[PDB]
Amino acid sequence: MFDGELIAKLVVELNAAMTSAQEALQFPDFEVVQKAQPTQQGTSTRPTIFFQKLFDIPRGWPATDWHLDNTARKYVEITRQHVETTFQISSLHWQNPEITHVVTASDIANYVRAYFQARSTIERVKELDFLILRVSQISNEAFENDNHQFEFHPSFDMVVTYNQYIRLYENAAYSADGVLIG
Amino acid sequence: IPGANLLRMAFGVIGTQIVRYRKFEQRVKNDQAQYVSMFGEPFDLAASVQRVRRDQYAQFNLEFQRNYVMIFANFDMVDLDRNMAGDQFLWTGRVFQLESQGSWFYQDGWGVCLAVDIGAAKA
């Protein structure tokens, strides 16, 4: 459980980061889009952000705590697992050689990476029940676009850690007795 | 019949073009273990030049289109052996890679467009 809410929160944060980056670097306009669209759709010409979820790691043995329901005389067993999620962030932008004002797709990716690593954003995200670890690499790759016009597709990976809960039922005991023999 | 040539009578109908043809004789070194070729007496030949029409590719963010030409001639043209091949130029220097039915009556060609010709009446 606890995935769609994570994507909604991440989308909101990415929109805020793009607003900040647009004020900082003077983009024309931006769009935030998830990869692996469930319906046949076409890419947009605007400077764009793409994100995707790759895999998860449980990170530790599960922890169980017991909560008692007096009316029904049952224990509600809650199990918490603290997992890590790896998201891949990539951007797209086409360079126009004749314009004098130059901004690169790698600049967009670097600014988004730097925004998420700031302490202020971490402090603000803490109230949203997850945190971000360190990011260690950003790479450029060359596509071919429309049979020409080589283009760059910078990318990097981000790790997000949170807690996820499951709920179950268990019986309860109210007394004890024994026998002593020798 | 594989006797009297068919290209000779074919040129009596379609119409041809004119190229300058030079052959390879021998080869020497340039104190770098690099061969430099020698060509002699570029004569004049009549031949039919055809169409193959290249497309380009990429090595990495480079294009490098390969220029190609097809030529029909009634001559014994060699493209490769332990010796070196011959040259031609319709407008720029060219070199080919193939063989054809020379020992009976006529052959067929190829060609890759080398850069340019020297000039001075297209030497």
The amino acid that residue A52 corresponds to is Q
**DSSP 8-class letter at B67:** P
Is A40 exposed, middle or buried (CB count within 10 Å of its CB: 0-12, 13-18, 19+)?
A: exposed
Comparing CA positions, the residue from A20, A80, A77 lying closest to residue A49 is A20
CB A51 within 8 A of CB A34: yes
* Backbone torsion region of residue A89, taken as left when φ is above 0, otherwise alpha when ψ lies between -120 and 50, otherwise beta: beta
Which contacts (CB < 8 Å, 24+ apart) does range A136-141 have?
A138/A106, A138/A109, A138/A110, A138/A113, A140/A106
Does A144 sit within 8 Å of B60, measured CB to CB?
A: no
CB B69 within 8 A of CB B108: no
B66 min Cα distance to partner chain A (Å) = 17
**What are A153's two structure tokens?**
């597709």
Q: Is B120 helix (H, G, I), strand (E, B) or coil?
A: coil
Provide, as residue numbers in chain B, all residues whose Cβ is less than 8 Å from the Cβ of A144. Answer: 58
Residue B63 CA, chain-centre distance (Å), reads 24
Per-residue three-class SS string for chain A: CCCHHHHHHHHHHHHHHHHHHHHHHCCCCCEEEECCCCCCCCCCCCCEEEEEEEEEECCCCCEEEEEEECCCCEEEEEEEEEEEEEEEEEEECCCCCCCCCCCCHHHHHHHHHHHHHCHHHHHHHHCCCCEECCCCCCECCEECCCCCCCEECCEEEEEEEEEEEEEEEECCCCCCCCCCCC
CB B74 within 8 A of CB B106: yes
Pairing of strands A31-34, A48-57: parallel
The CA distance from B78 to B100, in Å, is: 9
The Cβ of residue B21 has, within 10 Å, a number of other Cβ atoms equal to 18
Residue A152: closest C-alpha in chain B: B61
CB A167 within 8 A of CB A4: no
Resolution of this structure in Å: 3.1
- The helices-and-strands tally (H runs, E runs) of chain B is 1, 7
Does B60 sit within 8 Å of A142, measured CB to CB?
A: yes
Residue A176: which residues within 8 A CB-CB, separation 6 or more? none
Does A142 sit within 8 Å of B61, measured CB to CB?
A: yes
The CA distance from A92 to A47, in Å, is: 6
The CA distance from B110 to B29, in Å, is: 28
Provide, as residue numbers in chain A, all residues whose Cβ is less than 8 Å from the Cβ of B60. Answer: 142
CB A75 within 8 A of CB A169: yes
CB B74 within 8 A of CB B5: yes
